[PDB]
Design a protein around this nucleic acid. Sequence first.
DNA 1: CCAGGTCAGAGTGACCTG
DNA 2: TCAGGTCACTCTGACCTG
Lengths: 72, 71
Amino acid sequence: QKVCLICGDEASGCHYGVLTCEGCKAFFKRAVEGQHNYLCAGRNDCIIDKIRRKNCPACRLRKCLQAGMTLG
Amino acid sequence: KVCLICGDEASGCHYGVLTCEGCKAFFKRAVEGQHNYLCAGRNDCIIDKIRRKNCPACRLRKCLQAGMTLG
DNA sequence: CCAGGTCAGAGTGACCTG
DNA sequence: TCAGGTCACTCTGACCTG
Ligand SMILES: [Zn+2]
Ligand SMILES: [Zn+2]
Ligand SMILES: [Zn+2]
Ligand SMILES: [Zn+2]
């Protein structure tokens, strides 16, 4: 049973360099290529799991970057 | 003049409190429908116009602390 | 003025293809 | 293998109706 390194949910394989779920795969794609302005409502250390990963795109993207995800 | 929940421009007194259209609609949906709202922070998230969508749990909390109710 | 109703848009992710 | 495409779904709030 493989686990997403960002939200801890079931992973479907390695995406963009890192073992991730379908959600975090598609999110990282949109986040990097889009012109988004994410701002954490907390302290830039939010819990990112299956239920709360929608809550803070800022911390979700930060975890993607710190885990080493790259489009190429 | 200003929403007591997110600080945005308020449109009037809703459900007991001076709120914007967003926080009005949000509160009704939060108390009637079934929601699994859950804070990813420390239950003290900043609720302003830019970030009010980020944490429904804290947004609902501030609505209740302000005294909003449907009846 | 306020409660209740509504729908189009943004964000999401399950599913498919090669 | 994994990158790219897609679309029905949830949440939201500016706008409408009574
Ligand atoms: Zn994930
Ligand atoms: Zn955060
Ligand atoms: Zn508000
Ligand atoms: Zn919160």
